[PDB]
Amino acid sequence: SVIKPDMKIKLRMEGAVNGHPFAIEGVGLGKPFEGKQSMDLKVKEGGPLPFAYDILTMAFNRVFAKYPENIVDYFKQSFPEGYSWERSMIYEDGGICNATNDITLDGDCYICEIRFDGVNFPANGPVMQKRTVKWELSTEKLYVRDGVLKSDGNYALSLEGGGHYRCDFKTTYKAKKVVQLPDYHSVDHHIEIISHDKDYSNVNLHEHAEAHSE
């Protein structure tokens, strides 16, 4: 009924990094059952962003994930009511970001309200000096605790010249109604900035995600 092969995305993000506030809006399309999506993002407030844009892209919805039939799909069941998530991201040099997302459905469009706040990134680190290039393949491990869905991952940005910059994700997902809870599974995420402006005021973002079990 509710989940169609082609859906739209409309999103706004408001946040701050190291005290510098900003606002981004996005428009996109995705195929939920194939686990693919794309969106065009425009910076609307916050000058030219002074930090590496890669710290944001995982914040810009696990309904866009190919789930096989032997894994319970916590996310596609949760609609039309929807779900929210809460996330903390801890980088190996002390920068920490918190984020929230409230995802509702309206017609064939997902509406996303995102808040993002990062602090304590050093001035000579790869985020403030924009020395990140892309995220490696990311494996999210999802499990259940106290009746909500949690997930961990240990991800890595590659850096210009080689080497990697490590970040640990912790997410809590909360469906806005009772749904059936899955078993321990994992989701592989491929995130790619396909095209960007000079100072990243216009970014075209793509993600591909599939779930796996045994």
Tell me how far apart the alpha carbons of residues 6 and 21 are, in angstroms, rounded to a whole number.
Answer: 33
Tell me how far apart the alpha carbons of residues 88 and 171 are, in angstroms, rounded to a whole number.
Answer: 7
Tell me how far apart the alpha carbons of residues 167 and 159 are, in angstroms, rounded to a whole number.
Answer: 13
Place of tokens 């918190």: 98
Residue 147 has φ and ψ, to the nearest 5°, of 75, 0
Rounded to a whole number of angstroms, the CA Rg of the chain reads 17
Place of tokens 């995705």: 30
Q: In terms of Cα–Cα distance, which of 108, 82, 134 is closest to 28? A: 108
Dig out the tokens for 13 from the structure: 């993000």
Q: In terms of Cα–Cα distance, which of 134, 110, 130, 108 is closest to 121? A: 130
Q: In terms of Cα–Cα distance, which of 188, 171, 207, 192 is closest to 36? A: 207
Tell me how far apart the alpha carbons of residues 198 and 86 are, in angstroms, rounded to a whole number.
Answer: 31
Q: How many other C-beta atoms lie within 10 A of the C-beta of residue 108? A: 12
Query: This structure's resolution (angstroms)?
Result: 2.4
- Would you call 59 exposed, middle or buried from its count of C-beta atoms within 10 A (0-12, 13-18, 19+)? buried
Is residue 60 a contact partner of residue 13, using CB atoms and an 8 Å limit?
Answer: yes
Dig out the tokens for 52 from the structure: 């590496």
Sequence-distant (6+) residues with CB within 8 A of 104 are: 82, 110, 111
Amino acid at residue number 67 = Y
Tell me how far apart the alpha carbons of residues 59 and 36 are, in angstroms, rounded to a whole number.
Answer: 15
Dig out the tokens for 185 from the structure: 């599974």
Tell me how far apart the alpha carbons of residues 14 and 113 are, in angstroms, rounded to a whole number.
Answer: 8
Place of tokens 């210009």: 160
Is residue 208 a contact partner of residue 190, using CB atoms and an 8 Å limit?
Answer: yes
What residues pair up with 196 in beta bridges, in sequence order? 203
Q: In terms of Cα–Cα distance, which of 77, 150, 83, 80 is closest to 112? A: 83
* Alpha-carbon distance values, 145 to 40, 171, 172, 182 (Å): 35, 12, 10, 11
Q: 3-state SS of the chain?
A: CCCCCCEEEEEEEEEEECCEEEEEEEEEEEECCCCEEEEEEEEEECCCCCCCCHHHHCCCCCCCCECCCCCCCHHHHCCCCCEEEEEEEEECCCCEEEEEEEEEEECCEEEEEEEEEEECCCCCCCCCCCCEEEECCEEEEEEEECCEEEEEEEEEEEECCCCEEEEEEEEEEEECCCCCCCCCEEEEEEEEEEEECCCCCEEEEEEEEEEECC
Q: Give residue 130's Cα distance to chain centre.
A: 19
Is residue 24 a contact partner of residue 42, using CB atoms and an 8 Å limit?
Answer: yes
